[PDB]
Amino acid sequence: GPQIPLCANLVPVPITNATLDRITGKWFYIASAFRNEEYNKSVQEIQATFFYFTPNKTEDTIFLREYQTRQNQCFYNSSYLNVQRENGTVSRYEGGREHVAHLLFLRDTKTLMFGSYLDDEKNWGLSFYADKPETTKEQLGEFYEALDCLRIPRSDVMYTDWKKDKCEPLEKQ
Ligand SMILES: CN[C@@H]1C[C@H]2O[C@@](C)([C@@H]1OC)n1c3ccccc3c3c4c(c5c6ccccc6n2c5c31)C(=O)N[C@@H]4O
């Protein structure tokens, strides 16, 4: 039977053209937690990350430009996401493998989450993003609410530190 636990702030919803408009623009990676060992190992080294979404509605794709600071250096990538409208997921090929994430929303309109491996209690997790590099306490509290649905302790959360970003001064020029 169905395996994804639904709770107040963890609700998959179909991606529409209104959804694609809402996620168009620049986003900042704020925090995440997973039961999946590989994702935990990767994201624990991330100091900062921001990225740009540019949807192509007719082709069911999103153009992605990523600016990630780790090891005190700026690293860049561009690629295309595939959009699964009815499933409410996006997918990409990265690191020689496919990734799929549920696009998830909270009550505050300027944040969003990616749900990873949500049908797998051994591996599930959430990553949290906002339209500014730092969120308010109440904004972050919604992410903690969603994490409670996956029964992951807040002590497992990894956070970016915007003071450590190296990409912003380099993105243009
Ligand atoms: C490939 N990225 C991985 C799979 C999934 O979630 C993670 C958490 C994973 O990164 C470990 N993840 C991040 C973690 C830390 C900072 C940024 C990201 C990020 C972005 C994206 C995606 C993504 C798009 C489609 C399917 C799965 C996805 N995942 C991510 C991202 C993205 O599109 N932009 C972000 O930089």
Numbering used by the authors: -1 to 171
The authors write:
The α1-acid glycoprotein (AGP) is an abundant blood plasma protein with important immunomodulatory functions coupled to endogenous and exogenous ligand-binding properties. Human plasma lipocalins present as two variants known as AGP1 and AGP2 (or F1/F2/S and A forms, respectively).
Several aromatic residues line the binding pocket including Tyr37, Phe49, Phe51, His97, Phe112, and Tyr127 and form interactions with UCN-01 which is principally comprised of an extended aromatic ring system. Phe112 forms a CH-π interaction with the central benzene ring of UCN-01 and the Tyr127 hydroxyl group H-bonds to indole nitrogen N2. Glu64 and Arg90 sit above the plane of UCN-01 and form a salt-bridge connecting β-strands C and E. This carboxylate – guanidinium group interaction lies perpendicular to the UCN-01 aromatic system allowing the formation of a hydrogen bond from the lactam ring 7R-OH to Glu64 and a cation-π interaction with Arg90. Comparison with all four complexes shows that Phe112 is rotated toward the ligand plane of aromaticity in the case of CPZ and UCN-01, whereas it lies flat and is more restricted in the AMT and DSP complexes. The structure reveals that the hydroxyl group of UCN-01 is important and is oriented toward Glu64, forming a hydrogen bond and indirectly assisting with orienting Arg90. However, the reversal of the stereochemistry at C7 not only breaks this hydrogen bonding, but is likely to invoke a clash with Phe49 and a further shift from the optimal binding pose.
